[PDB]
């Protein structure tokens, strides 16, 4: 139905080891959890090659390894996880909602756990044509642009993904790429007929009129820069900042960009909780993450129960 | 045996495991000073199901361990130690155990929260009362000793005791059936099924059956933080106070773990505390700017 498949008591958005912990917490209090995780493949310890300062998790293990692990666990206690990217909320009622292009989830308790991979929109024209053209979620835009120009930019899991995701729609998918793709599973995106590679090109510059993006200005291995028609830009470059875009500036945030919270992880937003590297502290380790998720989850507990103590979860 | 170390941790649960682990991977000499590994709220665990990226049945000790051989792997000295003072009047802090006096730049208090408040157990604290054998066993050569409680802890200390006692008389609530090898000791008076209800001495303990040491080995839920002797700063509710680094109010000295007994008492939060402060304590000892993030 359709109170079963979106209406949850918890709502976590990302699937790193901080909304995993959470949810491996809130599922065995026996809270009704998703997890909605846009690419299990892009958060930062799913990228880690070997992670050996886990405690607990001795010898040679791969960070998706550790993370599917995690993930496992939060299933196996009941929590649903769903490959969902969210591109909104609304944080002004008791019942938060939670905008997916797979639709509303609804929780009373929400989580932001997204972690610090992202980017400021530093290319010229990017922060400009924001909404009017630039866009980082093909599941949500890509529709819009059925038999139009699209640019793709990145070389990477996502990015890789998304450029699929778009050949549904649009008449060519052009792919900037800083060094060669073959360096599968780019063989299954070169072999779409729209797919037009770019190699060793770099984006200059994202312009438009004021209806919104027209084109891009291109350098690819000659002094002169040329321009490329184009409607509909994605950008799926990696960074070092927090995550945070989604929120449209809902909830406070540190001098130094990331989500701030409490002793408890809540936001300033009543059932609203941050963990993780979303709120940019100095401490970017896993278990740190880890940490906050088991927190902020033993907070939702006594939150959703109107308990008068945190209740720990131990074993007898 | 060396006794000077960059980092000296107070406690070997997953806190001072982790921390000690993060430490050594930063090339910093780390000790761990542990007074029973099978002591902690950890390794007290039957089988621990929600430690993030350890699925299936996993006793607490079994966690441990691989934490522990984690940290020594990477280069710490782990000790069997007990800490019964400190010295944080100067930069260098100092650790007093009976096997010596340990030194560092940043020490770590990571001794968890199985304490209990002390029946006349207060009042005779130092003159008769302890809660460390291997400090003041020599004390008692031929004199009656009593100890309290059936745990890791309690059949380790009272061993220890039947070196020095003429009698040890051992209050357990139930059967003990390590407990063998101490039963078989022929100054061991085993005491079952037997409550201790009060502790009386004179100006000088002399009884509770006569005797002159009682030793308690019950296990509670308080931080354990009489061996700070008020040295940092407490919370009201009796947990060791820190910044958002875990730094106490002393500079160069750390609270980790259910020593700082928040309302969030699980392994994984202990470990992430652990994680945090030695982050911290790299930074401070090489007077960097910023934290420094270990990643492969
Ligand atoms: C190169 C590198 C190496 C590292 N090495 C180590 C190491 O050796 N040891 C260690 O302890 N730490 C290491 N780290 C740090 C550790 O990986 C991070 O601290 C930790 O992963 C942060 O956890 P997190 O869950 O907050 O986020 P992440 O692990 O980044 O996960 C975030 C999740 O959110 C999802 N997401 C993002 N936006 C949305 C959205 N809008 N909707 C839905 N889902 C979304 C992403 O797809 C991802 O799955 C490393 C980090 C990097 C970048
Ligand atoms: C019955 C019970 C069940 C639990 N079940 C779970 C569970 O299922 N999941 C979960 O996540 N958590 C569980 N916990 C909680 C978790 O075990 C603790 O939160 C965590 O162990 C705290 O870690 P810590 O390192 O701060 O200290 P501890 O793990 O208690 O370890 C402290 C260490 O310091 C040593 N020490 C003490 N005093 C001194 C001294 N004076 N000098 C030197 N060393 C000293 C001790 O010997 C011990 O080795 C449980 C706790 C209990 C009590
Ligand atoms: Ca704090």
């Given at each position: 139905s359709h109170m079963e498949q979106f209406d949850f008591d918890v709502v976590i958005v990302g699937g790193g080891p901080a909304g995993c912990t959470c949810a491996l917490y809130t599922a065995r209090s026996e809270l009704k959890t998703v997890i909605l995780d846009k690419n299990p493949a892009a958060g930062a310890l799913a990228i880690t090659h070997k992670i050996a300062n886990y405690p607990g998790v001795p010898g040679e293990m791969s960070g998706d390894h550790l993370l599917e692990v995690?993930?496992?666990?939060?299933?196996?206690?009941?929590?649903?996880?769903?490959?969902?990217?969210?591109?909104?909320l609304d944080l002004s009622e008791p019942v938060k909602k939670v905008y997916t292009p797979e639709g509303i989830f609804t929780g009373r308790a929400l989580v932001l756990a997204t972690g610090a991979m992202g980017r400021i929109?530093?290319?010229?024209?990017?922060?400009?044509?924001?909404?009017?053209?630039?866009?980082?979620?093909?599941?949500?835009?890509?529709?819009?642009?059925?038999?139009?120009?699209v640019v793709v930019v990145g070389l990477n899991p996502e990015a890789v993904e998304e450029a699929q995701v778009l050949t549904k729609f649009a008449s060519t998918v052009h792919w900037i790429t800083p060094k060669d793709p073959?360096?599968?599973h780019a063989d299954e995106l070169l072999a779409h007929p729209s797919v037009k590679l770019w190699e060793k090109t770099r984006l200059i510059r994202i312009k438009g009129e004021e209806a919104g993006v027209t084109a891009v200005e291109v350098r690819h291995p000659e002094s002169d820069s040329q321009e490329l028609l184009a409607e509909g830009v994605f950008v799926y470059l990696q960074g070092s900042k927090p995550i945070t875009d989604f929120v449209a500036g809902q909830v406070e945030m540190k001098p130094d960009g990331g989500v701030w919270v409490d002793e408890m992880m809540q936001t300033?937003?009543?059932?609203?909780?941050?963990?993780?590297?979303?709120?940019?502290?100095?401490?970017?380790?896993?278990v740190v993450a880890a940490g906050?998720?088991?927190?902020?989850?033993?907070?939702?507990?006594?939150?959703?129960?109107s308990r008068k103590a945190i209740k720990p979860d131990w074993a007898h």
């Open positions: 995690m993930r496992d666990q939060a299933v196996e206690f009941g929590t649903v996880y769903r490959r969902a990217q969210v591109y909104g929109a530093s290319i010229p024209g990017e922060a400009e044509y924001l909404g009017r053209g630039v866009s980082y979620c093909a599941t949500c835009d890509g529709a819009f642009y059925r038999n139009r120009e073959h360096t599968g300033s937003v009543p059932g609203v909780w941050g963990i993780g590297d979303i709120r940019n502290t100095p401490f970017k380790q896993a906050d998720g088991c927190i902020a989850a033993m907070a939702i507990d006594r939150f959703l129960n």
